[PDB]
Amino acid sequence: VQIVYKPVDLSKVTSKCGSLGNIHHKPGGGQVEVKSEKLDFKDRVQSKIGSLDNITHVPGGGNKKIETHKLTF
Amino acid sequence: VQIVYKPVDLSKVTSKCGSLGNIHHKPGGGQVEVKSEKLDFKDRVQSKIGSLDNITHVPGGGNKKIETHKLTF
Amino acid sequence: VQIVYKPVDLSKVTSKCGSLGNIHHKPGGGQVEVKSEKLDFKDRVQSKIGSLDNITHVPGGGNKKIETHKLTF
Amino acid sequence: VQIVYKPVDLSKVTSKCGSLGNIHHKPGGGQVEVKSEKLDFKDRVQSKIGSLDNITHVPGGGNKKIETHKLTF
Amino acid sequence: VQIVYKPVDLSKVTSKCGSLGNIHHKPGGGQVEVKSEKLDFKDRVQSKIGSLDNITHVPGGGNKKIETHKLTF
Amino acid sequence: VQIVYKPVDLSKVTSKCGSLGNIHHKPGGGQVEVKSEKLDFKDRVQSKIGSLDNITHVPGGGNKKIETHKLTF
Amino acid sequence: VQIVYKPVDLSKVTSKCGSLGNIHHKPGGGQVEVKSEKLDFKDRVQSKIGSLDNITHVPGGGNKKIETHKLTF
Amino acid sequence: VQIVYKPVDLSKVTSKCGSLGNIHHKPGGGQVEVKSEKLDFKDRVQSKIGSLDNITHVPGGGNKKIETHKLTF
Amino acid sequence: VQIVYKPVDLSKVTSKCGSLGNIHHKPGGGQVEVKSEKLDFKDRVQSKIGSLDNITHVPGGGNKKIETHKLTF
Amino acid sequence: VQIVYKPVDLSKVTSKCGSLGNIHHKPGGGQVEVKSEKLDFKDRVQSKIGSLDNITHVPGGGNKKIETHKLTF
């Protein structure tokens, strides 16, 4: 048997911004509490427990491009 | 048997912005509580327990493009 | 047997914005409580328990394009 | 047997905006409570339990385009 | 046997807006309560339990285009 | 002229409580707004403007006794 | 002229409590706003403007007794 | 002229409490805003402007007794 | 003219508490804002502007007694 | 003219407490802002501007007694 796999891609992902400006992010603080006797995790776990966070993700043009090229028998 | 797989793509993903401006995000704080005796997770778990977060995701043009090219027998 | 697979795509995804402006997002804080004795998760679970969050997702043109190209016997 | 699969697409998805303006989103806080003795999830579950959130998704032109190209025997 | 599959598409999805303006979304807070002894979910479940949320989805032109191209024996 | 003023009082004000118990007062938050150009107050004014309060007055027996003894010509 | 003023008082104000207990006061937060150009107060004013407060006044027996003994010509 | 002023008082103010207990006061945070161009106060003013407070006044028996003994010509 | 002023007082103010206990006061934080161009106060003013406070006044028996004995011509 | 002023007082202010206990006061932090161009105070002013405080006043029996004995012509 014969297989040919030549997927072509000629693509653009473009972002044009003149100016972002004055981003103000001032969060007031809260309170967080957790109480859990026994905890048992296994096999590829990614958890977040009792967390009070604040993020400001201001990329000056942040673009993604994902591809996946699978081939199996 | 014979297979040919030459999918072509010539695509644009464009964003044009003159100016974003003054984004104000001031959250007042809250309160969060959890109480759970026994916790048991397994096999590819991603959890969030008792979290008080605040995010400001202001990309200056944030575009996605996803493709998946699967081939199996 | 013979197969030919040459799907062509020449597509645009465009966003044109002159100016976003003054986005104000000021949430007042609340209260959240959970009490659950035993918790048992398995096999590709993504959960959110007892969370008080606030998000401001202001992309300056945020566009998606998704494709999936499957082929099997 | 013979198969030919050459679906062509030449499409636009366009958004033109002069200016968004002054979006005000000020939610007053509430209260949320949950009490559940035993919880057991399995096999591709994505849940949200006891959550008090607020989102402001103001893309400056946010457009989608989805395609799915399946072929099987 | 012979098959030919060349569906052509040359389509536009356009949105033209001069200006959105002043969108005010100020929700007063409520109260939510749930009490459920035993919970058991399986096989591709996506649930929301005891949630007090507020969303403001103001895309500056947000358009969709979906296609599905299936072929099987 | 002659005046005699000997008002006698031998009074009890009693409260007997065995046990108060579990008083739960969890108010959900609201929103309040006021807009008033010019405000002019004088001469023994006690006002409350634009206030979102919550009180829990649980005295373990709270009793009043008031008297006023006036005499004039 | 003659005046006699011998008001007698032999009074009790009593509170008997065995036990108060578990008083829970968890208020969810709200939002308050005021906008008033010109404000002019005079002569014994006590005001409250734009206030979001929470009080828990749990005296273990809180009793009042007031008297006023006036005499004038 | 003659005046006699011998007001007698033999009074009790009593509070008896066995035990107060577990007073929980957890207020969720709110948001408060005020905007007032010109402010002009005079002559014995006590004001509160733009305040987000929380009080827990738990006296172990807090009793008042007030008297006022005035005499004038 | 003759005046006699011998007001007698033999009074008790008593508080009896066996035990106060476990007072929990955990306030979540809020946000407060004020903007006022010109401020002009005079003559015995006591004000509070833009304050986010928290008080826990737990006297182990806190009692008041006030008297005022005025005499004028 | 003759005046006699011999006001007698034989009074108790008592507080009896067996034990106060475990007072927990953990306030979450907030945010406070003020902006006021011109400020002009005079004549016995006591003000508080832009203050984020926390007090725990736990006297082991804190009692007041006030008297005022005025006499004028």
XYZ file of C-alpha atoms in Angstrom:
730
model
C 0.000 0.000 0.000
C 1.033 3.605 -0.604
C 0.446 6.775 1.410
C 1.165 10.402 0.535
C 0.853 13.136 3.150
C 1.884 16.610 1.946
C -0.514 19.041 3.625
C 0.481 22.561 2.638
C -0.219 25.651 4.740
C 0.507 29.265 3.807
C -1.345 31.223 6.479
C -1.093 34.546 8.280
C -2.136 35.490 11.789
C -1.822 39.244 12.141
C -2.647 41.795 14.815
C -2.358 45.539 14.262
C -2.832 47.883 17.216
C -2.198 51.606 17.274
C -1.978 51.971 21.045
C -3.326 50.080 24.041
C -3.485 52.869 26.621
C -4.117 53.079 30.352
C -5.274 49.761 31.785
C -6.101 50.050 35.484
C -6.643 46.811 37.444
C -6.956 47.497 41.182
C -8.641 44.535 42.912
C -9.775 44.816 46.488
C -8.665 41.971 48.665
C -10.928 39.169 49.753
C -10.763 36.227 52.114
C -10.487 32.528 51.272
C -10.658 29.480 53.540
C -10.509 25.720 52.998
C -10.620 22.806 55.443
C -10.278 19.280 54.075
C -9.118 16.382 56.231
C -7.664 13.915 53.704
C -6.505 14.618 50.152
C -5.317 11.906 47.738
C -4.425 12.677 44.112
C -2.877 10.479 41.424
C -2.104 10.258 37.710
C -1.623 13.634 35.993
C -3.485 16.009 38.309
C -3.024 19.782 38.267
C -5.020 21.467 41.006
C -5.396 24.845 42.683
C -6.614 24.928 46.267
C -7.215 28.013 48.355
C -5.695 30.640 46.060
C -6.351 34.382 45.866
C -4.572 35.595 42.737
C -4.727 38.537 40.328
C -3.394 38.518 36.756
C -2.986 41.231 34.118
C -2.131 39.613 30.783
C -1.730 42.516 28.361
C 0.238 41.212 25.370
C 0.894 43.796 22.688
C -0.629 41.461 20.158
C -0.716 37.887 21.377
C -1.766 35.377 18.774
C -1.888 31.598 18.727
C -1.528 29.026 15.994
C -1.772 25.324 16.776
C -1.492 22.318 14.487
C -1.470 18.586 15.115
C -0.409 16.105 12.456
C -1.112 12.529 13.523
C -0.600 9.370 11.472
C -0.898 5.829 12.848
C -1.729 2.222 11.986
C -4.428 0.713 -2.029
C -3.415 4.334 -2.562
C -4.014 7.460 -0.482
C -3.316 11.106 -1.287
C -3.638 13.785 1.384
C -2.627 17.289 0.251
C -5.034 19.673 1.981
C -4.058 23.217 1.064
C -4.771 26.260 3.231
C -4.064 29.894 2.370
C -5.922 31.790 5.083
C -5.684 35.079 6.949
C -6.725 35.945 10.480
C -6.431 39.693 10.906
C -7.263 42.183 13.634
C -6.995 45.941 13.155
C -7.474 48.221 16.156
C -6.861 51.947 16.291
C -6.635 52.236 20.065
C -7.971 50.278 23.025
C -8.139 53.013 25.662
C -8.766 53.144 29.397
C -9.902 49.793 30.766
C -10.724 50.001 34.472
C -11.246 46.722 36.366
C -11.557 47.330 40.118
C -13.225 44.325 41.790
C -14.352 44.527 45.371
C -13.224 41.644 47.490
C -15.473 38.811 48.524
C -15.290 35.820 50.824
C -14.995 32.141 49.909
C -15.147 29.049 52.113
C -14.979 25.303 51.496
C -15.071 22.337 53.883
C -14.712 18.841 52.442
C -13.535 15.905 54.536
C -12.073 13.499 51.957
C -10.922 14.279 48.419
C -9.725 11.622 45.949
C -8.843 12.471 42.336
C -7.289 10.337 39.601
C -6.521 10.193 35.884
C -6.060 13.607 34.237
C -7.930 15.924 36.602
C -7.490 19.700 36.637
C -9.490 21.320 39.411
C -9.879 24.660 41.158
C -11.091 24.663 44.743
C -11.704 27.704 46.895
C -10.201 30.386 44.651
C -10.876 34.125 44.534
C -9.110 35.410 41.427
C -9.283 38.400 39.079
C -7.956 38.461 35.504
C -7.565 41.228 32.921
C -6.709 39.681 29.553
C -6.327 42.637 27.191
C -4.357 41.402 24.170
C -3.720 44.045 21.540
C -5.234 41.752 18.964
C -5.301 38.155 20.112
C -6.343 35.693 17.460
C -6.446 31.916 17.335
C -6.080 29.400 14.553
C -6.301 25.683 15.259
C -6.008 22.725 12.908
C -5.968 18.981 13.461
C -4.899 16.561 10.750
C -5.581 12.960 11.748
C -5.056 9.846 9.632
C -5.334 6.275 10.935
C -6.147 2.683 10.003
C -8.863 1.442 -4.037
C -7.870 5.078 -4.495
C -8.481 8.161 -2.354
C -7.802 11.824 -3.085
C -8.134 14.447 -0.361
C -7.142 17.980 -1.423
C -9.559 20.314 0.358
C -8.603 23.882 -0.488
C -9.326 26.876 1.740
C -8.641 30.533 0.952
C -10.503 32.362 3.706
C -10.278 35.612 5.639
C -11.319 36.403 9.187
C -11.043 40.143 9.690
C -11.884 42.574 12.468
C -11.635 46.341 12.067
C -12.122 48.558 15.111
C -11.526 52.283 15.319
C -11.297 52.496 19.100
C -12.615 50.472 22.023
C -12.794 53.152 24.714
C -13.415 53.205 28.452
C -14.533 49.820 29.754
C -15.349 49.950 33.465
C -15.851 46.630 35.293
C -16.158 47.160 39.057
C -17.808 44.114 40.672
C -18.931 44.238 44.259
C -17.784 41.319 46.315
C -20.017 38.452 47.295
C -19.815 35.417 49.535
C -19.501 31.759 48.543
C -19.634 28.622 50.684
C -19.448 24.889 49.991
C -19.521 21.876 52.318
C -19.148 18.413 50.807
C -17.951 15.440 52.841
C -16.481 13.095 50.212
C -15.341 13.953 46.687
C -14.135 11.353 44.162
C -13.262 12.277 40.567
C -11.702 10.208 37.785
C -10.939 10.144 34.064
C -10.499 13.592 32.487
C -12.376 15.852 34.901
C -11.956 19.627 35.011
C -13.959 21.181 37.819
C -14.362 24.483 39.637
C -15.569 24.408 43.221
C -16.194 27.401 45.436
C -14.709 30.135 43.245
C -15.403 33.874 43.203
C -13.648 35.229 40.120
C -13.841 38.266 37.833
C -12.519 38.405 34.260
C -12.149 41.227 31.732
C -11.289 39.752 28.331
C -10.926 42.757 26.028
C -8.955 41.594 22.979
C -8.336 44.292 20.403
C -9.844 42.045 17.785
C -9.889 38.425 18.860
C -10.924 36.011 16.160
C -11.009 32.236 15.959
C -10.633 29.780 13.126
C -10.833 26.048 13.757
C -10.531 23.141 11.347
C -10.471 19.387 11.823
C -9.393 17.026 9.063
C -10.055 13.402 9.986
C -9.519 10.335 7.807
C -9.775 6.737 9.040
C -10.574 3.161 8.036
C -13.304 2.191 -6.020
C -12.331 5.841 -6.409
C -12.955 8.874 -4.204
C -12.296 12.556 -4.861
C -12.636 15.124 -2.083
C -11.665 18.679 -3.077
C -14.090 20.965 -1.245
C -13.154 24.554 -2.020
C -13.888 27.499 0.269
C -13.224 31.174 -0.445
C -15.091 32.938 2.348
C -14.879 36.151 4.346
C -15.918 36.862 7.911
C -15.660 40.592 8.489
C -16.508 42.963 11.317
C -16.279 46.738 10.991
C -16.773 48.892 14.082
C -16.195 52.615 14.364
C -15.960 52.754 18.148
C -17.264 50.663 21.030
C -17.452 53.288 23.776
C -18.067 53.261 27.517
C -19.165 49.844 28.750
C -19.977 49.895 32.465
C -20.458 46.537 34.225
C -20.761 46.990 38.001
C -22.393 43.902 39.557
C -23.510 43.948 43.146
C -22.344 40.993 45.141
C -24.560 38.097 46.067
C -24.339 35.018 48.244
C -24.010 31.383 47.178
C -24.122 28.202 49.257
C -23.917 24.484 48.487
C -23.971 21.426 50.752
C -23.583 17.995 49.170
C -22.368 14.988 51.141
C -20.890 12.703 48.463
C -19.761 13.639 44.955
C -18.546 11.096 42.376
C -17.683 12.098 38.799
C -16.118 10.093 35.975
C -15.362 10.109 32.251
C -14.941 13.590 30.742
C -16.826 15.792 33.204
C -16.424 19.566 33.392
C -18.430 21.051 36.234
C -18.849 24.314 38.117
C -20.048 24.160 41.703
C -20.684 27.105 43.978
C -19.217 29.890 41.840
C -19.931 33.626 41.876
C -18.188 35.054 38.819
C -18.400 38.134 36.593
C -17.086 38.351 33.021
C -16.734 41.226 30.551
C -15.874 39.824 27.118
C -15.530 42.877 24.877
C -13.558 41.786 21.802
C -12.956 44.540 19.280
C -14.456 42.338 16.619
C -14.482 38.696 17.621
C -15.509 36.332 14.874
C -15.574 32.562 14.598
C -15.190 30.165 11.714
C -15.371 26.420 12.269
C -15.059 23.564 9.800
C -14.977 19.801 10.200
C -13.893 17.503 7.391
C -14.535 13.858 8.242
C -13.987 10.838 6.002
C -14.221 7.214 7.161
C -15.003 3.656 6.086
C -17.753 2.956 -7.983
C -16.800 6.617 -8.299
C -17.436 9.604 -6.032
C -16.797 13.301 -6.616
C -17.145 15.808 -3.786
C -16.194 19.391 -4.709
C -18.627 21.627 -2.827
C -17.710 25.234 -3.530
C -18.458 28.130 -1.180
C -17.811 31.820 -1.822
C -19.684 33.519 1.011
C -19.485 36.691 3.071
C -20.520 37.324 6.652
C -20.280 41.044 7.304
C -21.136 43.352 10.182
C -20.927 47.134 9.931
C -21.427 49.222 13.067
C -20.867 52.941 13.423
C -20.627 53.004 17.210
C -21.914 50.850 20.050
C -22.111 53.418 22.850
C -22.720 53.314 26.588
C -23.799 49.867 27.754
C -24.604 49.838 31.471
C -25.065 46.441 33.164
C -25.364 46.816 36.949
C -26.977 43.689 38.443
C -28.089 43.656 42.034
C -26.905 40.669 43.969
C -29.104 37.741 44.839
C -28.864 34.623 46.953
C -28.517 31.010 45.814
C -28.610 27.785 47.828
C -28.390 24.086 46.983
C -28.423 20.982 49.186
C -28.019 17.586 47.533
C -26.785 14.547 49.441
C -25.302 12.324 46.714
C -24.182 13.336 43.225
C -22.958 10.852 40.593
C -22.108 11.932 37.035
C -20.536 9.993 34.168
C -19.787 10.086 30.445
C -19.386 13.600 29.005
C -21.279 15.742 31.516
C -20.896 19.514 31.777
C -22.904 20.930 34.653
C -23.336 24.154 36.603
C -24.529 23.919 40.187
C -25.176 26.816 42.521
C -23.727 29.649 40.438
C -24.459 33.381 40.551
C -22.730 34.878 37.520
C -22.961 38.002 35.357
C -21.654 38.300 31.789
C -21.321 41.225 29.377
C -20.459 39.899 25.916
C -20.134 42.997 23.736
C -18.162 41.978 20.636
C -17.579 44.786 18.170
C -19.073 42.630 15.468
C -19.078 38.968 16.394
C -20.097 36.656 13.603
C -20.144 32.891 13.250
C -19.752 30.556 10.317
C -19.914 26.799 10.797
C -19.590 23.996 8.271
C -19.488 20.225 8.594
C -18.398 17.991 5.737
C -19.020 14.326 6.516
C -18.460 11.354 4.214
C -18.673 7.707 5.298
C -19.439 4.165 4.154
C -48.189 79.730 96.892
C -46.965 76.251 97.794
C -45.991 73.276 95.642
C -45.160 69.704 96.632
C -43.741 67.259 94.099
C -42.818 63.840 95.529
C -43.699 61.313 92.827
C -42.698 57.871 94.051
C -41.794 54.966 91.769
C -40.988 51.400 92.814
C -41.009 49.520 89.516
C -39.381 46.480 87.948
C -38.482 45.803 84.338
C -37.408 42.183 84.055
C -36.436 39.860 81.228
C -35.807 36.147 81.727
C -34.437 34.105 78.832
C -33.225 30.528 78.958
C -31.207 30.615 75.745
C -31.298 32.631 72.537
C -29.753 30.148 70.103
C -28.518 30.271 66.523
C -29.416 33.542 64.823
C -28.353 33.558 61.173
C -28.457 36.892 59.301
C -26.861 36.589 55.851
C -28.019 39.473 53.625
C -27.280 39.442 49.938
C -25.782 42.634 48.657
C -27.714 45.208 46.712
C -26.968 48.392 44.820
C -27.751 51.978 45.815
C -27.356 55.207 43.848
C -28.122 58.868 44.520
C -27.568 61.995 42.419
C -28.514 65.361 43.904
C -26.992 68.613 42.666
C -27.335 70.955 45.662
C -27.872 70.024 49.307
C -28.433 72.586 52.085
C -29.224 71.544 55.668
C -29.514 73.616 58.843
C -30.621 73.526 62.474
C -30.430 70.075 64.096
C -30.557 67.746 61.095
C -29.536 64.085 61.224
C -29.699 62.462 57.811
C -28.664 59.272 56.046
C -28.029 59.426 52.316
C -27.046 56.539 50.093
C -26.357 53.897 52.747
C -26.376 50.103 52.477
C -26.093 48.803 56.034
C -26.854 45.615 57.972
C -27.373 45.416 61.744
C -27.792 42.507 64.161
C -28.887 43.845 67.551
C -29.178 40.771 69.768
C -29.093 41.988 73.379
C -29.339 39.234 75.956
C -32.243 41.049 77.522
C -32.355 44.692 76.533
C -34.913 46.734 78.397
C -35.685 50.435 78.506
C -37.088 52.714 81.159
C -37.564 56.414 80.483
C -38.904 59.157 82.726
C -39.227 62.905 82.308
C -39.974 65.195 85.233
C -40.693 68.741 84.081
C -41.747 71.695 86.231
C -41.964 75.295 85.000
C -43.702 78.639 85.478
C -43.512 81.227 97.227
C -42.307 77.760 98.201
C -41.345 74.736 96.111
C -40.534 71.181 97.176
C -39.125 68.679 94.694
C -38.220 65.286 96.196
C -39.109 62.708 93.544
C -38.127 59.286 94.840
C -37.236 56.332 92.617
C -36.450 52.783 93.735
C -36.476 50.837 90.477
C -34.861 47.758 88.974
C -33.960 47.002 85.380
C -32.903 43.374 85.172
C -31.938 40.988 82.394
C -31.330 37.283 82.967
C -29.966 35.175 80.117
C -28.772 31.596 80.318
C -26.750 31.608 77.107
C -26.824 33.559 73.859
C -25.287 31.019 71.478
C -24.048 31.063 67.898
C -24.925 34.304 66.132
C -23.856 34.240 62.482
C -23.941 37.535 60.545
C -22.340 37.155 57.104
C -23.481 40.000 54.818
C -22.735 39.890 51.135
C -21.218 43.047 49.791
C -23.133 45.592 47.791
C -22.368 48.732 45.836
C -23.135 52.343 46.757
C -22.722 55.528 44.726
C -23.468 59.208 45.322
C -22.896 62.288 43.161
C -23.826 65.688 44.574
C -22.285 68.906 43.273
C -22.621 71.310 46.220
C -23.169 70.455 49.883
C -23.722 73.076 52.607
C -24.523 72.111 56.210
C -24.808 74.248 59.341
C -25.921 74.238 62.973
C -25.750 70.819 64.664
C -25.884 68.429 61.709
C -24.882 64.767 61.916
C -25.048 63.077 58.536
C -24.027 59.847 56.837
C -23.386 59.922 53.106
C -22.415 56.985 50.944
C -21.742 54.395 53.650
C -21.781 50.595 53.459
C -21.509 49.366 57.041
C -22.290 46.223 59.044
C -22.817 46.103 62.816
C -23.253 43.244 65.291
C -24.348 44.658 68.652
C -24.658 41.630 70.928
C -24.572 42.918 74.515
C -24.837 40.219 77.147
C -27.734 42.080 78.672
C -27.826 45.703 77.608
C -30.375 47.796 79.427
C -31.128 51.502 79.458
C -32.524 53.840 82.063
C -32.980 57.530 81.311
C -34.310 60.323 83.495
C -34.614 64.064 83.003
C -35.354 66.417 85.879
C -36.050 69.943 84.654
C -37.094 72.944 86.743
C -37.290 76.520 85.440
C -39.012 79.882 85.845
C -38.828 82.706 97.540
C -37.642 79.254 98.587
C -36.691 76.183 96.560
C -35.899 72.646 97.698
C -34.499 70.086 95.268
C -33.616 66.720 96.841
C -34.515 64.095 94.240
C -33.553 60.694 95.606
C -32.672 57.690 93.446
C -31.905 54.163 94.636
C -31.937 52.151 91.418
C -30.335 49.033 89.980
C -29.431 48.200 86.404
C -28.395 44.564 86.272
C -27.438 42.117 83.543
C -26.848 38.422 84.193
C -25.490 36.249 81.388
C -24.316 32.668 81.664
C -22.288 32.606 78.457
C -22.347 34.488 75.169
C -20.820 31.895 72.843
C -19.574 31.860 69.265
C -20.432 35.068 67.431
C -19.358 34.925 63.787
C -19.422 38.181 61.783
C -17.819 37.724 58.353
C -18.940 40.527 56.006
C -18.190 40.339 52.328
C -16.655 43.459 50.925
C -18.554 45.974 48.870
C -17.769 49.070 46.853
C -18.518 52.702 47.699
C -18.086 55.845 45.605
C -18.814 59.539 46.125
C -18.223 62.571 43.903
C -19.138 66.004 45.246
C -17.578 69.186 43.882
C -17.908 71.651 46.780
C -18.464 70.876 50.458
C -19.007 73.553 53.129
C -19.820 72.665 56.748
C -20.099 74.866 59.834
C -21.217 74.935 63.464
C -21.067 71.551 65.224
C -21.209 69.102 62.318
C -20.225 65.440 62.600
C -20.395 63.683 59.255
C -19.388 60.412 57.623
C -18.740 60.411 53.894
C -17.781 57.423 51.792
C -17.125 54.886 54.553
C -17.185 51.085 54.437
C -16.926 49.927 58.044
C -17.725 46.828 60.108
C -18.258 46.788 63.882
C -18.713 43.982 66.414
C -19.806 45.469 69.742
C -20.136 42.487 72.081
C -20.049 43.850 75.640
C -20.332 41.205 78.327
C -23.222 43.111 79.808
C -23.291 46.713 78.672
C -25.835 48.856 80.442
C -26.569 52.565 80.398
C -27.957 54.962 82.952
C -28.393 58.638 82.124
C -29.710 61.482 84.251
C -29.994 65.214 83.681
C -30.727 67.628 86.507
C -31.405 71.132 85.210
C -32.435 74.180 87.236
C -32.611 77.731 85.861
C -34.315 81.107 86.196
C -34.136 84.166 97.831
C -32.969 80.730 98.950
C -32.031 77.615 96.987
C -31.260 74.099 98.197
C -29.869 71.483 95.822
C -29.006 68.144 97.463
C -29.912 65.470 94.915
C -28.972 62.093 96.352
C -28.104 59.043 94.253
C -27.356 55.536 95.518
C -27.393 53.459 92.340
C -25.806 50.305 90.968
C -24.900 49.394 87.411
C -23.880 45.751 87.354
C -22.932 43.247 84.678
C -22.363 39.561 85.403
C -21.012 37.325 82.646
C -19.857 33.745 82.995
C -17.824 33.607 79.795
C -17.868 35.423 76.467
C -16.352 32.775 74.199
C -15.100 32.660 70.624
C -15.937 35.837 68.724
C -14.858 35.615 65.085
C -14.902 38.829 63.014
C -13.297 38.294 59.597
C -14.399 41.055 57.193
C -13.644 40.788 53.521
C -12.091 43.872 52.056
C -13.974 46.354 49.949
C -13.170 49.405 47.872
C -13.903 53.057 48.641
C -13.450 56.154 46.486
C -14.160 59.862 46.929
C -13.548 62.847 44.647
C -14.448 66.310 45.918
C -12.871 69.456 44.495
C -13.191 71.979 47.342
C -13.757 71.282 51.033
C -14.292 74.015 53.649
C -15.116 73.205 57.282
C -15.388 75.470 60.325
C -16.512 75.619 63.948
C -16.382 72.269 65.779
C -16.530 69.764 62.922
C -15.568 66.103 63.280
C -15.740 64.279 59.969
C -14.748 60.971 58.406
C -14.093 60.890 54.679
C -13.147 57.858 52.638
C -12.509 55.372 55.452
C -12.587 51.570 55.413
C -12.340 50.483 59.043
C -13.158 47.433 61.168
C -13.698 47.468 64.941
C -14.172 44.719 67.528
C -15.261 46.278 70.826
C -15.611 43.346 73.223
C -15.523 44.781 76.755
C -15.824 42.191 79.493
C -18.704 44.143 80.930
C -18.755 47.721 79.721
C -21.291 49.912 81.444
C -22.005 53.624 81.323
C -23.386 56.079 83.826
C -23.799 59.739 82.924
C -25.106 62.633 84.988
C -25.370 66.353 84.345
C -26.095 68.827 87.121
C -26.753 72.308 85.752
C -27.772 75.401 87.713
C -27.926 78.924 86.265
C -29.613 82.317 86.529
C -29.437 85.611 98.100
C -28.290 82.191 99.290
C -27.365 79.032 97.392
C -26.613 75.537 98.674
C -25.232 72.865 96.357
C -24.388 69.556 98.067
C -25.306 66.836 95.570
C -24.384 63.486 97.077
C -23.527 60.388 95.042
C -22.802 56.903 96.378
C -22.843 54.762 93.244
C -21.269 51.574 91.938
C -20.364 50.587 88.402
C -19.364 46.938 88.419
C -18.423 44.374 85.797
C -17.874 40.701 86.597
C -16.531 38.404 83.889
C -15.394 34.825 84.313
C -13.358 34.612 81.118
C -13.386 36.362 77.756
C -11.880 33.660 75.542
C -10.623 33.467 71.972
C -11.442 36.609 70.008
C -10.358 36.306 66.376
C -10.381 39.479 64.243
C -8.772 38.866 60.839
C -9.857 41.585 58.377
C -9.098 41.239 54.712
C -7.527 44.286 53.188
C -9.396 46.734 51.027
C -8.571 49.737 48.889
C -9.286 53.408 49.585
C -8.814 56.456 47.368
C -9.505 60.177 47.735
C -8.875 63.112 45.394
C -9.759 66.605 46.594
C -8.162 69.714 45.108
C -8.474 72.297 47.902
C -9.051 71.676 51.606
C -9.575 74.464 54.165
C -10.409 73.733 57.815
C -10.674 76.060 60.809
C -11.802 76.287 64.426
C -11.694 72.975 66.325
C -11.851 70.412 63.519
C -10.907 66.755 63.953
C -11.085 64.865 60.680
C -10.105 61.521 59.186
C -9.446 61.363 55.462
C -8.512 58.284 53.486
C -7.891 55.854 56.349
C -7.989 52.051 56.387
C -7.752 51.035 60.039
C -8.590 48.034 62.225
C -9.136 48.150 65.994
C -9.628 45.455 68.636
C -10.715 47.085 71.899
C -11.083 44.206 74.355
C -10.994 45.710 77.856
C -11.310 43.179 80.646
C -14.185 45.174 82.038
C -14.216 48.726 80.758
C -16.741 50.963 82.431
C -17.436 54.676 82.233
C -18.808 57.189 84.686
C -19.202 60.832 83.707
C -20.499 63.774 85.711
C -20.742 67.481 84.992
C -21.458 70.016 87.715
C -22.096 73.471 86.276
C -23.102 76.610 88.172
C -23.236 80.103 86.655
C -24.906 83.508 86.845
